[PDB]
Amino acid sequence: SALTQPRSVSGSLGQSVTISCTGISSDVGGDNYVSWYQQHPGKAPKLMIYDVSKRPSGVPDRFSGSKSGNTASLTISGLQADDEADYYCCSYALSRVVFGGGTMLTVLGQPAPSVTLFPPSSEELQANKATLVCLISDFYPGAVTVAWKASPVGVETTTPSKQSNNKYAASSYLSLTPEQWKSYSCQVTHE
Amino acid sequence: SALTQPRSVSGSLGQSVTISCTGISSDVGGDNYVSWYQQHPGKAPKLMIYDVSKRPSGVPDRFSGSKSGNTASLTISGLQADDEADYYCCSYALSRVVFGGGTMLTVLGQPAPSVTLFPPSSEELQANKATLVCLISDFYPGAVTVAWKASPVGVETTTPSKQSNNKYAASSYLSLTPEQWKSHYSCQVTHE
Amino acid sequence: SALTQPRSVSGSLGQSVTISCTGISSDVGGDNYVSWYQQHPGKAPKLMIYDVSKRPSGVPDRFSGSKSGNTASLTISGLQADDEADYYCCSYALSRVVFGGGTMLTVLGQPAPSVTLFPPSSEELQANKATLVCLISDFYPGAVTVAWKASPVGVETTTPSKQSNNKYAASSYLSLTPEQWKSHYSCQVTHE
Amino acid sequence: CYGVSPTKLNDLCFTNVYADSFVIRGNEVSQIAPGQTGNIADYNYKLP
Amino acid sequence: CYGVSPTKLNDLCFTNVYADSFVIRGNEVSQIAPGQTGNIADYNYKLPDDFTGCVIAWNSNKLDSKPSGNYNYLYRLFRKSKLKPFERDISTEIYCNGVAGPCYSPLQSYGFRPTYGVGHQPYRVVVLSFELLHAPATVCGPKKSTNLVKNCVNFNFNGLTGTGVLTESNKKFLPFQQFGRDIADTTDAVRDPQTLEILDITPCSFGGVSVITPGTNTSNQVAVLYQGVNCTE
Amino acid sequence: QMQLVQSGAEVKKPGESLKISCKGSGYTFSYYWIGWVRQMPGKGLEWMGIIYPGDSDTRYSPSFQGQVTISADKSISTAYLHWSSLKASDTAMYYCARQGDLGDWILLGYWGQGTLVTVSSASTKGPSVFPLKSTAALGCLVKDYFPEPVTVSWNSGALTSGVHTFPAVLQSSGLYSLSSVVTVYICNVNHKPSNTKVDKKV
Amino acid sequence: VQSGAEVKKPGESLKISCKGSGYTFSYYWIGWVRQMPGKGLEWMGIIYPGDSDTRYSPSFQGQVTISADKSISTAYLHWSSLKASDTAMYYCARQGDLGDWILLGYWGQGTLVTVSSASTKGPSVFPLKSTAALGCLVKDYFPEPVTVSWNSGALTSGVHTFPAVLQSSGLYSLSSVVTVYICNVNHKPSNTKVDKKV
Amino acid sequence: QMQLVQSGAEVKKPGESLKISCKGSGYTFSYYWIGWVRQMPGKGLEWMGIIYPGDSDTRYSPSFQGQVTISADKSISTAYLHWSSLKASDTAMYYCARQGDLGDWILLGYWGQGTLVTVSSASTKGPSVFPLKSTAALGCLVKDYFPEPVTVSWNSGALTSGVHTFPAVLQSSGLYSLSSVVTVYICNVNHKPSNTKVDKKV
């Protein structure tokens, strides 16, 4: 058997969430072989919920679970900022550990991104490089468009970012040549 | 069962001493489950006498034991100054370790206590305190009396000392106010 | 039983040598319990040939073995200058390994030694000593005559030498008195 | 195996086989057997 | 357990139980049984053919073994003749002249070391010799005693179970005699452990049952004949 | 308190068969199980197997029967993994787990810090650092580097307050680029898996 | 060498240790024996380097557990829900090739665990006609294990330290002499060091 | 890769019962047999016995049943030898070997560094160094030293090119002597049995 979980979930702060995960087996000895793990993006996983009839030490009391047939549910009341992490269900009835598909809890809440400019150094100009960097951060939504205006303008950027201070960031590198730079303004687009 | 040992013994330099040990049990397999341990005051214990039918390694030949029924004895000869230590007999016939009530080995021999007086410092007088300390040391007998004269005068004292120089030491700390101290002291020491 | 091996063998550069060793036993389960080991003079032994039906990892393909009754043969092709080392046969059929008498593999090839003289220092002369050292090197044979001229002249020397750079060297220490050293010398060297 | 052989077992039939499962102490393995007595064989699980 | 059950042991009595204690080598645990042969059996400790009891033995490598060599355990290897069952030999004679060197010392030592695996590890053996017979029982199990009733109930005298009636006997049982036996090899009288009175053991009333009945095609009424038993019984 | 630590992150080529280990301390590492997990980030996690350091007992997942073996050393209380014929499908994150006194033997009690392993044949190209109205803040740029894990520091770690590091941006040509700024200075970049240290001053 | 004894309250699960040498921690029994101030030795239990067939004393079946470390040959002890009467000098002993398995051939150093709840009040130093000898006084300190040195231990001969005297208010006071100078006082429970010059 | 190392060379007198050790790492030491090989100067090899680190199933050679015992510390994966009643017939080289993944349990896969145990009675006589028209090279002479393992260096080993050392020559009086020259300077001689370093300048 294989565990099933949605690819992505979302929930506003203060409300409860019930993550579903099917595929639970049963053997001689019980059927409560269900545990949950919390793995933050870019961090080590932590044991938060195991043996839902009981609770571990140090885990807040806002986490709970219940069993209903072959389907379990993880009830987390009062979603906070530190609750934005991945949750995985585990089944260990057949002396083997099986992980689910993973559910990324994208929390939502109340949020003008900062616009800055940084010109390249002379070491890049001497090497026929005119990489212009337009740094944009301090934006709550996970969507941001960065470009340049000559005509709509190589250029690469990353929309998502790691969570370290409950905020998102972005950056772009207008990898052009000084011959084309001498012959521009950063374009900012946000919801 | 509990092993019974004398609380304190009185030996002598060059003489011998026999420490008693009763209450030793026995099981099927033997009756020589008797071992003694040497523990110096404030130091680490060392195995001294075990299997009295044999002789341990490194232990001087002036230590031996004997067995008589359920009562054992530790024969120690050539008592010296460094021989002052605690001794305990052990019984392990029933795979259980038991110890005695504690033994203190004291030796006699040829023994004037040092009497010194120190006035309180200025830091004590500034803090509205006046502590009169009378130090007593360099006395072999265990007889000492501390007293001051004001008419006779909180005050605490400790007669026993720590085994560091094989000599006894006692001190008393008389705590009085500086106003009453400046209005008048001497230390009176009684020794054999 | 005891393994038999020739003490010294003679070879040449680019030729082949077949080391012989008898006295190998056998038990139930197989008879190929034969292995060879190589140990350079002054170095740790290294496993070169074991289970002659196969070859170890990292060992060059020029090493191979074979079995014929109770006699084993170690075939080495292309004897180079760095192949001068000892070889031993091992039999582990009776769960007890045994080693032969040792086979010192020597090679021959095309070879005027360098003769130098060094007088002793003043620290030896002041201590009523005089050590005349004659250094001989750059000679291919493992034997050389060391002497001095006064008429030709305790004194000790070593005929063999370790293979540090695929060559041989020699040294001697003529211990005499400073008076006899200042009374006259010349080192007498004779090569085969 | 009581009444059946351990090796000659894949060539027989059964009506309904029930696989029990329980963990006991090491010194209690001599008590899980027909006709045996003890604390377990009289209070927890007994074989006819 | 020879003659007794390992589990059905707390409900019986014994005359005098002796626990033989000795430690032997691991691989040498083969002759501890009635009627065995070998060096250990015929030299150090032999069991009779009529042995009754449990030969308890377990591994003691962590207690009776030392890495420096635990030579405090010895064993007799040479002897003039075979050893009789339940016999001890502590003599240190050399089995010639006064000392050994040519005759050798029959008291060798075991190489008890934790390095040696199974086979050479020391094993403690406790031979619980049991003797259950007509002798007066001095040691029994933790079972409690019940009230004594006389004149058809089940009885249990020192583990001897049965069914019968009890009656005041006029026999002359001796102080060392506890059980009685008739011609039919059955227990006819037994001495109570608590009181020194003697009570006879007689089976309850019984008898043949002969049914007197006519043909089935005639009637269904039958008659019962208790042969050998009076109507008043 | 009980402690657990893995080995450092490394990048190897297919066929090197690295030996990433796991160091345990603070308790008797003989009576507690220990294991590892690894899987592509786009597929979640996958259990590899566990080993009991007390005696001979090993259990592996059906998906890791002959792909990887697990071993442990009870003496120094250090586990040791071993791979064979590493392929391109082995670029996954390796996390360790132990039994723990919280659940059963199969339940994972604690976790390590992680060990990133990436399979690549780019010969471990060395990184390059290039510096950048505001003056005020400064920053540096690292480009022309194939491996993803790159550590950037300012004055060898002398400045910690006001220092921020942005995630790397993968260009269309197949190279990454990240930006590191500091609130106000030599920006030191030392690639630990390749022992390549490049210094640059704004 | 053993670790120090920090002042702990009943219920904090403290830990003691001891370092031994001169043997192989493979098949030699090893245990711990405590000694309360004013009484004799009390054997608790022993542990085996292999299978930990621990045999605890009947008075120590559920009071103390053995958690000795085998990888470093350093013994350790674990406690849970301690009491005030647990203050004792724990001695680490091993089997040794001298006697049987239960016989103790060698012993450790011993550390006296101190249990108190007086908030670990900081000490105080005060100075003091013979000149010829000098001394210093230490007062207003509750913990007993307080040591006094002279010039950070530069002078060893002619230096003596007298035992502390228990005051009526629960505190102590210590006196020291030196043959003749800065006297240094170190307080381990509070990690406070006070210097004074006569 | 798997590595193996032994203890330093020792020189004792008959009757001291010296002890040697051997430490290995990089593999499961408790699953490979380990033993020692005796090598007398000028004769073939001799095998004493082996030991399994898991359980010390020591199997000694019939010629070494009451001359030396073999032990191993499973807690640290370190072997320990103990020679009882040392005599003059114990001045042989001791090489250790392991099982390895090459042959069977008795086949010696790898070897150690070796430890020299030389029986002597000169009470570890201290060494002495003496220095030496043709200028061109300089050299130093070490005389009046009984122990054999004595090395000569130049400027604490800072100069390696043109440095050569000749084997020691044993005199009839019972003392060795070796010559060390350097192509052109302070010559440093270290004595291992006495831990004394003598400095000399030509």
Contacts of G78 in chain F (CB under 8 A): none
- Match 């072959």 to its residue by tokens: A70
Structure tokens at F76: 């120094």
B117/G162 Cα distance (integer angstroms) = 15
Specify the long-range contacts of residues G15-19, CB closer than 8 Å, at least 24 apart.
G15/G76, G15/G77, G15/G78, G15/G79, G16/G76, G16/G77, G16/G90, G16/G111, G16/G113, G17/G74, G17/G75, G17/G76, G17/G77, G18/G74, G18/G75, G18/G90, G18/G91, G18/G92, G18/G108, G18/G109, G18/G111, G19/G73, G19/G74, G19/G108
Q: What are the C-alpha distances in Å from F54 to residues F27, F59, G77? A: 13, 14, 21
The burial class, CB within 10 Å (0-12 / 13-18 / 19+), for A27 is: exposed
- Which residues in F lie closer than 8 A to residue G69 (C-beta atoms)? 28
Q: Phi and psi dihedrals of E73, rounded to 5?
A: -105, 125
Q: Is the CB of residue B28 less than 8 Å away from at least one CB of chain E?
A: yes
| β-bridge mates for residue G66, sequence order | G77
Residues 6+ apart with CB under 8 A from G42: B99, G33, G34, G35, G36, G57, G59, G88
| Yes or no, beta carbons of H77 and F73 under 8 Å apart | yes
The alpha-carbon gap from A42 to the nearest alpha carbon of chain F, in Å, equals 10
Nearest CA in chain E to H53: E115
Q: What are phi and psi of F153, to 5 degrees?
A: -135, 160
Question: Which of A51, A102, A123 minimises the CB distance to F103?
Answer: A51
Question: Quick one: how far is CA F56 from the chain centroid?
Answer: 29
Q: Which residue has the tokens 């080529």?
A: F13
F197 C-beta neighbours (distance < 10 Å), count: 14
- Partner-chain contact D31 E6, CB within 8 Å: no
Q: How many whole angstroms separate alpha carbon G181 and alpha carbon E199?
A: 101
Q: Looking at chain A, which residue has its C-alpha nearest residue D23?
A: A29
Mutate to test the interface with G, among H75, H80, H81 (most CBs of G within 10 A): H75
Residue G28 to residue E67, Cβ atoms within 8 A: yes
Q: State chain D's maximal CA–CA distance in angstroms.
A: 37
Best of G71, G77, G78, G80 to mutate (most F CBs within 10 Å, chain F):
G71
Q: Are G29 and G46 in contact (CB under 8 A)?
A: yes
CA atoms within 13 A on the CB side of B10: 3
- Are E122 and E65 in contact by the 8 Å Cβ rule? The answer is yes
* Chain B closest-CA separation from residue E19 CA (Å): 10
Write down which chains contact chain E via at least 3 CB pairs under 8 A.
B, D, G, H
* Residue H17 structure tokens: 């019962």
CB-based contact, H32 to chain F, within 8 Å:
no
**Is residue B168 exposed (0-12), middle (13-18) or buried (19+ Cβ within 10 Å)?**
buried
| Pairwise CB contact (< 8 Å): G162 & B116 | no
**Dihedral, E115, E120, E121, E123 alpha carbons, nearest 10:** -170
Among the listed residues G71, G102, G83, the one whose alpha carbon sits nearest the alpha carbon of residue G14: G83
Contact F111 A123 (CB under 8 A): no
Query: Which alpha helices (DSSP H) does chain E contain, by range?
Result: 39-43
Chain F residues 72-111 within an 8 A CB cutoff of chain H: 73-76, 80
Strand-strand pairing, B103-108 and B8-12? parallel
Cβ within 8 Å, pair E117-H58: no
Distance separating alpha carbons of residues C25 and C19, to the nearest angstrom: 18
Is H158 part of the contact surface with chain G (CB cutoff 8 Å)?
A: no
Contact residues, F window 34-93, toward A, CB-based 8 Å cutoff:
37, 39, 44-47, 59, 61-62
H with A: 3 or more CB pairs under 8 Å? no
* Cross-chain residue pair C154–H113, CB shorter than 8 Å: no
> What phi and psi values does residue B131 have, to the nearest 5 degrees?
-105, 120
Q: Based on C-alpha coordinates, what's the Rg of chain D?
A: 13
Site of tokens 């460094």:
B82
Chains F and E touch (3+ CB pairs under 8 A): no
Opening angle at CA F30, ends F24 and F33, nearest 5: 75
Query: Which residue from E minimizes the CA distance to G28?
Result: E66
Beta-bridge mates of residue B114:
B137
Nearest CA distance, G73 vs chain H (angstrom): 8
Chain A contact for F201, CB < 8 A? no
User: Strand C103-106 and strand C8-10: pairing?
Assistant: parallel
Nearest CB neighbour to B102, from listed G39, G57, G102: G39
Helix (H, G, I), strand (E, B) or coil at B87: strand
**Cα dist. E222→E206, E210, E211, E229, F196 in Å?**
21, 11, 7, 19, 116
CB F100 within 8 A of CB F107: yes
- Distance (Å, rounded) from C-alpha C149 to C-alpha C132? 12
State the Cα torsion E90-E96-E100-E101 to the nearest 10°.
Answer: -150
The C-alpha of D18 sits at a distance from chain A's nearest C-alpha, in angstroms, of 12
Let me know: does A22 contact A3? Beta carbons within 8 Å.
Answer: yes
Beta strand extents in chain G (DSSP E only): 15-19, 30-35, 41-47, 55-56, 65-66, 74-78, 89-94, 106-107, 111-112, 124-127, 133-141, 146-150, 159-161, 165-166, 172-179, 182-187, 192-197
Cα(B142)–Cα(F168) distance, integer angstroms: 82
Strands H115-116 and E208-212: unpaired
Alpha-carbon separation of residue E165 from C156, E150, H7, H179 (angstroms): 114, 7, 87, 113
- Measured between beta carbons, the chain E residues lying within 8 angstroms of B28 are 19, 21
Q: Which technique?
A: cryo-EM
Rounded CA-CA distance F91/F168 in Å is: 18
Listed in sequence order, the residues at least 6 apart from A131 whose beta carbon sits closer than 8 Å to its beta carbon are: A120, A124, A173, A174, A175, A176, F141, F143
Handedness of CA G103, G106, G112, G115 (dihedral sign): negative
Q: Measured between alpha carbons, how far is residue G151 from residues G161, G194, G198, H151 in Å?
A: 14, 12, 12, 45
Q: How far apart are alpha carbons C186 and E200 in whole angstroms?
A: 128
Question: Of A82, A46, A48, whose CA–CA distance to A65 is shortest?
Answer: A48
Give me the residue label for tokens 């007889």. B143
- In the block, residue with structure tokens 């079972």: E143
The Cα–Cα gap between F159 and F139 comes to: 13
- Say yes or no: F170 contacts chain A, CB-CB below 8 A: yes
Scan residues 15-34 of C and list those with Cβ closer than 8 Å to H: none
Chain F residues whose CB is inside 8 A of the G70 CB are: 28
- Best of A26, A27, A28 to disrupt the D interface by mutation (most D CBs within 10 Å)? A28
Q: Taking CA C17 as the corner, what is the angle to CA C11 and CA C23, rounded to the nearest 5 degrees?
A: 120
Q: Do F167 and A169 touch (CB under 8 A)?
A: yes
CB contact under 8 A, G25 and H73: yes
Provide the terminal-to-terminal Cα distance of chain C, rounded to the nearest Å. 42
